[PDB]
């Protein structure tokens, strides 16, 4: 606060004050001298309390509106990410079979649970032990959901290759047993 128009008012008021004080004329002339500076120091109080409280509010307004801009940019970012995720995931829809089923609905509505039961081109089965494996995924091909599926890949809880010959009764205790087996819809 030095480039305010009244800083000259300090200049003149205190300059005259010190001049006439070092001169030491009388109090009869010092009354006006010590009242001019007295009203001056109040003038500064007014026009300085009118300014120094403005910078904090301007600064906080810039903070708030800058973070508002940041939030707005993040909004565009998430919009783009969401839309591209939808469009990339839809491209897997395999748009031939699902059309056949939806054409067969009375109005077009079909329960969701049968969409992967009739149209999905891959199956993965998790088996807890060899016994249940015998009942479901024995051999190089099996059946489920009124369809025939053919084995291609088997892994264990450690996501490492294990061959179909390795899953026997006696060799079983040497394997992790949330076994994963993936099969393809045979045609």
């Amino acid at each position: 606060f030095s480039s305010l128009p009244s800083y000259a008012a300090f200049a003149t008021a205190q300059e005259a004050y010190e001049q006439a004080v070092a001169n030491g004329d009388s109090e009869v002339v010092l009354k006006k001298l010590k009242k001019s500076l007295n009203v001056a120091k109040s003038e500064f109080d007014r026009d300085a309390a009118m300014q120094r409280k403005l910078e904090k509010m301007a600064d906080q307004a810039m903070t708030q509106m800058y973070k508002q801009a940041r939030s707005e940019d993040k909004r565009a970012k998430v919009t783009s990410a969401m839309q591209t995720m939808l469009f990339t995931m839809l491209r897997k829809l395999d748009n031939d079979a699902l059309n056949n089923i939806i054409n067969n609905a009375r109005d077009g509505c079909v329960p969701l649970n049968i969409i992967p039961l009739t149209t999905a081109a891959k199956l993965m089965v998790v088996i807890p032990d060899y016994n249940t494996y015998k009942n479901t995924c024995d051999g190089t091909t099996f059946t489920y959901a009124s369809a025939l599926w053919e084995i291609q890949q088997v892994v264990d809880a450690d996501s490492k290759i294990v061959q179909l010959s390795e899953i026997s009764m006696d060799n079983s205790p040497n394997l992790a047993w949330p076994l994963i087996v993936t099969a393809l819809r045979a045609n």
């Binding site: 264990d156 809880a157 450690d158 992790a176 949330p178």
Partner: protein
Amino acid sequence: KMSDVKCTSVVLLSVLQQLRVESSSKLWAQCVQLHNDILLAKDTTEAFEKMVSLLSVLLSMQGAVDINKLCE
């Protein structure tokens, strides 16, 4: 005295996990079984045999230099 047993079992399974023993599903499963058995036990003699059993798992590896660590 069993309190010390449970505390050292806790620390031992902690270091076992930080040694990435968890990457072997069955090994980590057995170690977790042993830990849960020790903390729930009520007699001190069973705790000793369980803790040495699960410590054999640590001592079978080669990722912790025992001789340097045993500085006395």
